[PDB]
């Protein structure tokens, strides 16, 4: 696991809370064997090109969590300015205004909100970023089509 | 406007009974076309700890178009104009007439986390976010201290 013992206890508390009282459109599926590898699903919000899809993702809690944010991957394929070719979520997404008081609930809200409002100024998917900024309806069409297949 | 009154009533009932996290609605039966709301500034943003009062103005062409939104709490945010008006182009993105007040409110809450400076109504906040993020955040946090 490689987390300080009181951090493991805080993570256990938080994930157990998120299983019992999940945020809207988010589900967490903890594995008690390893709480640092967290499977999550986020519903694509209505009013976005991801509407109707279920987006599987993984959070990896590194040894410095929560001084540092976790790493996040989309396991569901997605056409999103801030999601790289291997599914990695752009590190500035979670680093911006990150403090050690933040946890998994914050990460998950930040990622869900990123589906509504990408940040194309820092696009890892340069094609998706350019389309969003320059021809929004074409970005949306491409993201919708991939959601139809993969979500 | 009759249709507006009918539509707002059903959704407002659900939003009062089962509000989204961080969001509260305060309907006034006298006029359901003008809807007062609060949104908690999310943690992990320059708005953290603030309570943001806002209102929606539902026009006669709702839900073909999104409602107009205003922040009533003063805010330093790329997508919020001098008079508190919330950028219409942002609320229009992927808008269709099956959408309602819940989507609008989630869209605005999530805009506090991820501004869209490419369409900044507040040119200074948009430029600072892109070119001097720490100054943007400092300015927004200081205003949240006073107004939130
Ligand atoms: Na939007
Ligand atoms: Na942010
Ligand atoms: Na953005």
Nearest residue to A25 (alpha-carbon basis) of A48, A7, A6: A48
Size of interface A-B (CB pairs under 8 A): 72
Q: Across chain B, where does the E strand assignment appear?
A: 23-26, 34-40, 51-57, 68-71
**CB-closest option in B44, B99, B118 to A98:** B44
Instruction: Give me the long-range contacts of A33-37 (CB less than 8 A, separation at least 24).
Output: A34/A1, A35/A1, A35/A3, A35/A8, A35/A11, A35/A61, A36/A1, A36/A2, A36/A3, A36/A11, A36/A60, A36/A61, A36/A62, A36/A65, A37/A61
- Stated in angstroms to one decimal place, the resolution of this structure is 1.5
Burial grade of B135 (CB within 10 A; 0-12, 13-18, 19 or more): middle
**Which among A59, A83, A90, A93 is annotated as catalytic?**
A90
Can you tell me the distance from the alpha carbon of B93 to that of A140, in angstroms, rounded to the nearest whole number?
9
Nearest to A74, CA basis, from A114, A120, A30, A131: A114
Name which of A68, A111, A117 to mutate to probe chain B: the one with the most chain B Cβ atoms within 10 A of its Cβ: A117
**Which experimental technique did the depositors report for determining this structure?**
X-ray
- For residue A147, the surrounding DSSP H or E stretch is helix A136-150
CB A121 within 8 A of CB A74: no
Q: Give bridge partners of residue B23 from the DSSP assignment.
A: B39
Q: Which of B87, B90, B91, B120 is catalytic?
A: B87
Element (H, E) at B83: none
H-state helical runs in B23-132: 88-92, 101-113, 123-131
């Amino acid at each position: 696991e490689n987390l300080p013992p009181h951090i493991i206890r805080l993570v256990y508390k938080e994930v157990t809370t998120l299983t019992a009282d999940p945020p809207d459109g988010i589900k967490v599926f903890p594995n008690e064997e390893d709480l640092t590898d967290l499977q999550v699903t986020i519903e694509g919000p209505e009013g976005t090109p991801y509407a109707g899809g279920l987006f599987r993702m993984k959070l990896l809690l590194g040894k410095d969590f929560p001084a540092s944010p976790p790493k996040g991957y989309f396991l569901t394929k997605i056409f999103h300015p801030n999601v790289g070719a291997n599914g990695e979520i752009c590190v500035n997404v979670l680093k911006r205004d990150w403090t050690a008081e933040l946890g998994i609930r914050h990460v998950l809200l930040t990622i869900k909100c990123l589906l509504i409002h990408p940040n194309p100024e820092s696009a890892l998917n340069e094609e998706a970023g350019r389309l969003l900024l320059e021809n929004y309806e074409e970005y949306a069409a491409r993201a919708r089509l991939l959601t139809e297949i993969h979500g």
